[PDB]
Design a protein around this ligand. Sequence first.
Ligand SMILES: *[C@@H]1O[C@H](CO)[C@@H](O[C@@H]2O[C@H](CO)[C@@H](O[C@@H]3O[C@H](CO[C@H]4O[C@H](CO)[C@@H](O)[C@H](O[C@H]5O[C@H](CO)[C@@H](O)[C@H](O)[C@@H]5O)[C@@H]4O)[C@@H](O)[C@H](O[C@H]4O[C@H](CO)[C@@H](O)[C@H](O)[C@@H]4O)[C@@H]3O)[C@H](O)[C@H]2NC(C)=O)[C@H](O)[C@H]1NC(C)=O
Ligand SMILES: *[C@@H]1O[C@H](CO)[C@@H](O[C@@H]2O[C@H](CO)[C@@H](O[C@@H]3O[C@H](CO[C@H]4O[C@H](CO)[C@@H](O)[C@H](O)[C@@H]4O)[C@@H](O)[C@H](O[C@H]4O[C@H](CO)[C@@H](O)[C@H](O)[C@@H]4O)[C@@H]3O)[C@H](O)[C@H]2NC(C)=O)[C@H](O)[C@H]1NC(C)=O
Ligand SMILES: *[C@@H]1O[C@H](CO)[C@@H](O[C@@H]2O[C@H](CO)[C@@H](O[C@@H]3O[C@H](CO[C@H]4O[C@H](CO)[C@@H](O)[C@H](O[C@H]5O[C@H](CO)[C@@H](O)[C@H](O)[C@@H]5O)[C@@H]4O)[C@@H](O)[C@H](O)[C@@H]3O)[C@H](O)[C@H]2NC(C)=O)[C@H](O)[C@H]1NC(C)=O
Ligand SMILES: *[C@@H]1O[C@H](CO)[C@@H](O[C@@H]2O[C@H](CO)[C@@H](O[C@@H]3O[C@H](CO)[C@@H](O)[C@H](O[C@H]4O[C@H](CO)[C@@H](O)[C@H](O)[C@@H]4O)[C@@H]3O)[C@H](O)[C@H]2NC(C)=O)[C@H](O)[C@H]1NC(C)=O
Ligand SMILES: *[C@@H]1O[C@H](CO)[C@@H](O[C@@H]2O[C@H](CO)[C@@H](O[C@@H]3O[C@H](CO)[C@@H](O)[C@H](O[C@H]4O[C@H](CO)[C@@H](O)[C@H](O)[C@@H]4O)[C@@H]3O)[C@H](O)[C@H]2NC(C)=O)[C@H](O)[C@H]1NC(C)=O
Ligand SMILES: *[C@@H]1O[C@H](CO)[C@@H](O[C@@H]2O[C@H](CO)[C@@H](O[C@@H]3O[C@H](CO)[C@@H](O)[C@H](O)[C@@H]3O)[C@H](O)[C@H]2NC(C)=O)[C@H](O)[C@H]1NC(C)=O
Ligand SMILES: *[C@@H]1O[C@H](CO)[C@@H](O[C@@H]2O[C@H](CO)[C@@H](O)[C@H](O)[C@H]2NC(C)=O)[C@H](O)[C@H]1NC(C)=O
Ligand SMILES: *[C@@H]1O[C@H](CO)[C@@H](O)[C@H](O)[C@H]1NC(C)=O
Lengths: 110, 654
Amino acid sequence: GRVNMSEDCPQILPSTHIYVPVGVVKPITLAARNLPQPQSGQRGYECLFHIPGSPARVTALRFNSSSLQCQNSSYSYEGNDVSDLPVNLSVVWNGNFVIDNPQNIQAHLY
Amino acid sequence: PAFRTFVASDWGLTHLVVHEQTGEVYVGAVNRIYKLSGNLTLLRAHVTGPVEDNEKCYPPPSVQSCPHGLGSTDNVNKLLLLDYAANRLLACGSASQGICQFLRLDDLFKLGEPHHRKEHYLSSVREAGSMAGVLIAGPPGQGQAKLFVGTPIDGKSEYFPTLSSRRLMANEEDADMFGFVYQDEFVSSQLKIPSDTLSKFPAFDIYYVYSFRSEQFVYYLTLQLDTQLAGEHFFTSKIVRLCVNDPKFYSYVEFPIGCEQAGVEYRLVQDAYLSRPGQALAKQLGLAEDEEVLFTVFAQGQKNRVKPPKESALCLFTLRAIKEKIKERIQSCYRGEGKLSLPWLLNKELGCINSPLQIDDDFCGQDFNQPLGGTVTIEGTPLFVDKEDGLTAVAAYDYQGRTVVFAGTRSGRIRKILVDLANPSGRPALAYESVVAQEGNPILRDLVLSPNRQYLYAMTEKQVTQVPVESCVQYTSCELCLGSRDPHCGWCVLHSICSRQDACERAEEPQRFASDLLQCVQLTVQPRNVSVTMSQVPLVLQAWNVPDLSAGVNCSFEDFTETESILEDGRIHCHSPSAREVAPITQGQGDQRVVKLYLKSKETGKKFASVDFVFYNCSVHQSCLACVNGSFPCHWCKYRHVCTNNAADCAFLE
Ligand SMILES: *[C@@H]1O[C@H](CO)[C@@H](O[C@@H]2O[C@H](CO)[C@@H](O[C@@H]3O[C@H](CO[C@H]4O[C@H](CO)[C@@H](O)[C@H](O[C@H]5O[C@H](CO)[C@@H](O)[C@H](O)[C@@H]5O)[C@@H]4O)[C@@H](O)[C@H](O[C@H]4O[C@H](CO)[C@@H](O)[C@H](O)[C@@H]4O)[C@@H]3O)[C@H](O)[C@H]2NC(C)=O)[C@H](O)[C@H]1NC(C)=O
Ligand SMILES: *[C@@H]1O[C@H](CO)[C@@H](O[C@@H]2O[C@H](CO)[C@@H](O[C@@H]3O[C@H](CO[C@H]4O[C@H](CO)[C@@H](O)[C@H](O)[C@@H]4O)[C@@H](O)[C@H](O[C@H]4O[C@H](CO)[C@@H](O)[C@H](O)[C@@H]4O)[C@@H]3O)[C@H](O)[C@H]2NC(C)=O)[C@H](O)[C@H]1NC(C)=O
Ligand SMILES: *[C@@H]1O[C@H](CO)[C@@H](O[C@@H]2O[C@H](CO)[C@@H](O[C@@H]3O[C@H](CO[C@H]4O[C@H](CO)[C@@H](O)[C@H](O[C@H]5O[C@H](CO)[C@@H](O)[C@H](O)[C@@H]5O)[C@@H]4O)[C@@H](O)[C@H](O)[C@@H]3O)[C@H](O)[C@H]2NC(C)=O)[C@H](O)[C@H]1NC(C)=O
Ligand SMILES: *[C@@H]1O[C@H](CO)[C@@H](O[C@@H]2O[C@H](CO)[C@@H](O[C@@H]3O[C@H](CO)[C@@H](O)[C@H](O[C@H]4O[C@H](CO)[C@@H](O)[C@H](O)[C@@H]4O)[C@@H]3O)[C@H](O)[C@H]2NC(C)=O)[C@H](O)[C@H]1NC(C)=O
Ligand SMILES: *[C@@H]1O[C@H](CO)[C@@H](O[C@@H]2O[C@H](CO)[C@@H](O[C@@H]3O[C@H](CO)[C@@H](O)[C@H](O[C@H]4O[C@H](CO)[C@@H](O)[C@H](O)[C@@H]4O)[C@@H]3O)[C@H](O)[C@H]2NC(C)=O)[C@H](O)[C@H]1NC(C)=O
Ligand SMILES: *[C@@H]1O[C@H](CO)[C@@H](O[C@@H]2O[C@H](CO)[C@@H](O[C@@H]3O[C@H](CO)[C@@H](O)[C@H](O)[C@@H]3O)[C@H](O)[C@H]2NC(C)=O)[C@H](O)[C@H]1NC(C)=O
Ligand SMILES: *[C@@H]1O[C@H](CO)[C@@H](O[C@@H]2O[C@H](CO)[C@@H](O)[C@H](O)[C@H]2NC(C)=O)[C@H](O)[C@H]1NC(C)=O
Ligand SMILES: *[C@@H]1O[C@H](CO)[C@@H](O)[C@H](O)[C@H]1NC(C)=O
């Protein structure tokens, strides 16, 4: 679990844009690198969506060191003012450990 | 001495296993999996437990949402298997539809825990030990490591297979784990419970007790339900087998197994243990060196698998004899005779297809006459029967030929049995019994000898206990040493201790080590009785069953004095102590003092052989009656009115 090289860091890699319609049950598959196996007394993964209106906490599954997925859920924002809203997402495990997001990958709620 | 022990601080224990290289002991428990040293010190503790979950939920909450309410439940270690090849431990739990864990061998680091796919789920069943299996491997690049594993199903016929042949990839993170060896839309390397058989008999289920790899196969001792024995539940204990190289699963065989003792039926397996017999039992059971044997434990009748009877019997099966019963049964169905006869699997009875074949022990099954059952129930050779305290577990081993058997009890006791049916004796005799959790914590099936085979780790609900196979040093005397009979023990004459052949220095030499009670040190002194008034008396010593003492010997009357002796013929000549030395002893004890005259060997410097030696005092008698009509040679002087050994010390003649 020692990181000495910058390329070996826990980070989320981008895919072609994350499209999310409001009020539709969807899974959100992610790719990444060197995702840790949670150890003794350590919980699993969650996706946290930073929507000013409503912030959603959805638990996820780490399939291997290189892929994640938040589970079937629907999302919304209260306004009807902007069609395309990009949202900061943070991928957490064991409650508060936020994985690094270099490209600052966002979820588009349309 | 004290028994080395590991206590279960909070929860119950379920499984134990020993690493053949290190002697590290791994211990499966509810919510915990421990690594322990050879002497049972805690080395590492893994939390596997209390998980928020629900048994009714398919794929567990991690993968899909379940409408059933969740609660913090306990995760029971169902299984534990050492994968030496991939430097790890397969630590299969429950309470997640039975997801399996991989812990690294030397530190318990979770390498992987696959739970996305449906194969990564093993069974809902929350019961400990109702599961078993074996790990089998080939070299990297070749046909990879496989796991054969049986489990109960709880009626979830379509979710899980009871018996399966599954893949073990080198990457624990690899998704391919616990996938079947060969999957087809027609036939997969698995065996499911048919839905029709669950509709007919409501809660039929297969509970897997023990399992082992032998030569090229894989056996399982199982418990099943009433299917030709809706009503009530009555169980039938059976043997199962497969070829290791049979992806199609056509080799499946299933014979009922038990044994009878004076018209009393024993049909419920509690444990088993595959072993060797060593030169002794092998010869008079008629076997070749590498021929295997199966010790077992059965309870009386076919009632209450959940809580069996006290009445229990340790039986025996030679694998050559079970191999012949299976070969005999197959060369029979390939004569076209009768049906396959396997109730729970095939509800409508398909018939035996005749065909010309070379029926061998190498036969791995064919397309037609398929998976098949057994008619003639295989009877075992009984050995020992407990009636007041139920046997629970068993192990065995080869020691210098003689075959030692270990037997757990409901009380928390271990029996150390020499099996002597093939040996000279009338029937196999108990040698010794020992205590672990005396209060009445039962011993569990997982009972493993160490790698050096010096100890035997004995597990309870609540504690692991290092019970030595050999601990002859508890024996104080040649007469008790060789009297216990537990075959590791001999009297190392010159060291005056009881222990094994390899532990007694120079044992190989003549008379230095005693193995039959008749070899015991036996000693005699010619002048048994010597008066206090005498000094430096010559005594002759006859001793038999003693090694060459040309090394030198001293006589020590006790830890008081020590006189040098010289050797002639088959006799030892030494002297009594001086009057100056003798009286310091006899002062206080009056009439006489019986004293244990030892021999102290020059080579060892330890007292080994003893005799009753009497120091008598005449003078202290103060009356004629005490003097003469006592027990000793003493003379009374009428006139001086004194008692003495010398006639001349008397007043005068008359
Ligand atoms: C074999 O067994 C004999 C007899 O049992 C042992 O000989 C005894 O030795 C002990 C010494 O440790 C004596 O005990 C002490 O006695 C003295 C006083 O002794 C006087 O009284 C005697 C009793 O009637 C009497 O026999 C004595 O006379 C003898 O001596 C003269 C001279 O040698 C001789 O000529 C006679 O023929 C007698 O032999 C004598 O008058 C006393 O001081 C001690 O008592 C003190 O200590 C005790 C305990 O602490 C305490 O309770 C008292 O209060 C007091 O303070 C002590 O008792 C004993 O007298 C001897 N027995 C005899 C019959 O004489 C001896 O152990 C063995 N023999 C050998 C050769 O080893
Ligand atoms: C780490 O773990 C991750 C995630 O668990 C793995 O990523 C997965 O990779 C697999 C490839 O093995 C991907 O599987 C593919 O899925 C396609 C399904 O898409 C359909 O889905 C639904 C339901 O079926 C349809 O309604 C919808 O219309 C889609 O069409 C399949 O079509 C693919 O099958 C094809 O390829 C295979 C293998 O070559 C062939 O056998 C088939 O015939 C077919 O041609 C394929 O199975 C999967 O998408 C990824 N998972 C996720 C969640 O997205 C990684 O593999 C793993 N990484 C490492 C390094 O181990
Ligand atoms: C005290 O210690 C002495 C050790 O010397 C013990 O004495 C031995 O006692 C047993 C019986 O208790 C005797 O065994 C018997 O032997 C009988 C034959 O006896 C003749 O042969 C003897 C040996 O060859 C010989 O000693 C003996 O002569 C004796 O008697 C003479 C006449 O009285 C006397 O002048 C001598 O000095 C001598 O003492 C005989 O000719 C046999 O018939 C019996 O069936 C039995 O086997 C031993 O012989 C005794 N040993 C000796 C050397 O005399 C004694 O038991 C101890 N005392 C106690 C109370 O325990
Ligand atoms: C873990 O288990 C191991 C064994 O599985 C154990 O370590 C061993 O301890 C024994 C003694 O219990 C040691 O054996 C000694 O060997 C030396 C020779 O190098 C002898 O000098 C010793 O003799 C002494 O003890 C005798 C019996 O008590 C006396 O009669 C004699 O006078 C001596 O004083 C003795 O035979 C041995 O050193 C190790 N074994 C190995 C392989 O090193 C230990 O109990 C456990 N350790 C832990 C940390 O849990
Ligand atoms: C077998 O028997 C022989 C002969 O019977 C015996 O030989 C004895 O050896 C010891 C030495 O170990 C001798 O004792 C010594 O004598 C001198 C006087 O000459 C004393 O000053 C010494 O005593 C001191 O040391 C003692 C022990 O530490 C103390 O208790 C004491 O206070 C003194 O400081 C010294 O030990 C002894 O003389 C002979 N015995 C006779 C009868 O002469 C030997 O024990 C045995 N042989 C073997 C190889 O074991
Ligand atoms: C959504 O995420 C974006 C991007 O992460 C947030 O906007 C910006 O966040 C960055 C942090 O990377 C802030 O940059 C900071 O700049 C100062 C310059 O003095 C520097 O010292 C810091 O080290 C840091 O890099 C930046 O302030 C911030 N932008 C604004 C306008 O405040 C954004 O906050 C997120 N959206 C929501 C709604 O929270
Ligand atoms: C003295 O020795 C004699 C003879 O050995 C003992 O005689 C015993 O006398 C009783 C009668 O009271 C008999 O019933 C026993 O059978 C006799 N015993 C033996 C061995 O012959 C007597 O006990 C001794 N007396 C004393 C005071 O020591
Ligand atoms: C929810 O996700 C699962 C797994 O990806 C999928 O089988 C199912 O189609 C999804 N359900 C809905 C309603 O979108």
